[PDB]
Structure formats: structure tokens, C-alpha cells
Amino acid sequence: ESQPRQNFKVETEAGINRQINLELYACYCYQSMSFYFDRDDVALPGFTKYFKEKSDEEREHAEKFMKYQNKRGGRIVLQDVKKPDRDEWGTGLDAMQASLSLEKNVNQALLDLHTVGDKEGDKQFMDFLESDYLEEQVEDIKKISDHITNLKRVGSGLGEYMFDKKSLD
């Protein structure tokens, strides 16, 4: 057993390694999204910047889980990060809805990972998940929902152009 390991179960360790891969996958999706909106036939610089920032956030999420794995005495096992499931992301509305669905899937995986910690009695891990992940997911999912509502409100064309300027920095 590694020196720090205490109240840290193998199932919790394995759950963290699957979550690392999922956060890396989300980071990859957002990176794809960002450079899609940098296409010359898409050309929405607010969307480009917004998904780039979201991509860096997911990379931070993954690395924080890596750091935590080490803190508790687990061992990081990396896997292929799959390519995103689309090459092209439609309109700003489509991308924002794909992003909502993505964040809700990450949130469910996090809640399932909380359930592993809870049944194993990992008090510290539950609070770590709560403080550093669950609250952020809830804020993010609310923010993206608002954006979807406004992208429906403004419509295509000028509306989408104006949303890019006024709702995304």
C-alpha cells in the first residue's frame, strides 16, 4: 500500500481514473467546438473564445483529479481519449445544446462517482467532489441553459451575430 493510503478504496481509485478520461474527453470536445467556430465559413469569434476557455476549464478538471489521485495514494492509469462524436457543430444554438448535453453527462458521472465515495465511507472524497466539482457543474449547466434560451430568442442571422458580441464577452 502506498504511504498515504488511508480510507481509500480500490473502487474509488478506479472511479477517479474513469472520470479523468471523461474530463479529458470534454476538454477535447470543447477544443473541437472552438476551432469549428474559427472556420472561415462559420467565423464567430465569441463562440471561439468561449469554447476555448471551456476547454481549458475541463483540462484543469482532469488535472485536479490527477493531483487528487496522487494525494490519496492511488495510481493514475490513462486511456485513449476518444475523438469527439461530431466534426461539425451546426449553429451556435446547436453547439450550445451539444454542450448542455455534454455537461449533464459529466455531472451524472460525477454524481455516480460521489455514490461510490459515499458507500465506501470516503468522507474526504465526497467533500472534495462537492466543493470542487458539483457546485461548478450546477453553475455551468444553468449558464448554458440561459444561453440556449437567448439563442432561441434572437434567432438565426443577425440574432446569432449579436449574441456572439453581447452575451459572450
Q: Select the binding partner of residue 64 from a second copy, Fe ion, none (C-beta < 5 to 8 A, by kind).
A: none
Q: Is residue 14 close enough to count as binding a second copy by CB under 8 A?
A: no
What are the CA-CA distances from residue 83 to residues 30, 49, 113, 122 (Å)? 11, 21, 23, 33
Using CB under 8 A, which of 42, 98, 109, 168 touches a second copy? Answer: 42
61 is in an annotated binding site: yes
- Write each residue from 46 to 65 as x if it is in contact with a second copy (CB under 8 A), else as -, in one continuous string: -------------x---x--
Residue 85 CB, nearest approach to a second copy (Å): 11
Which residues have CB under 8 Å from 83's CB, separation 6+?
28
Residue 102 CB, nearest approach to Fe ion (Å): 8
54 is in an annotated binding site: yes
What are the CA-CA distances from residue 93 to residues 35, 138, 144 (Å)? 16, 20, 10
Using CB under 8 A, which of 6, 14, 94, 169 touches a second copy? Answer: 6
Q: What torsion, rounded to 10 degrees, do the Cα atoms 60, 66, 67, 70 define?
A: 180
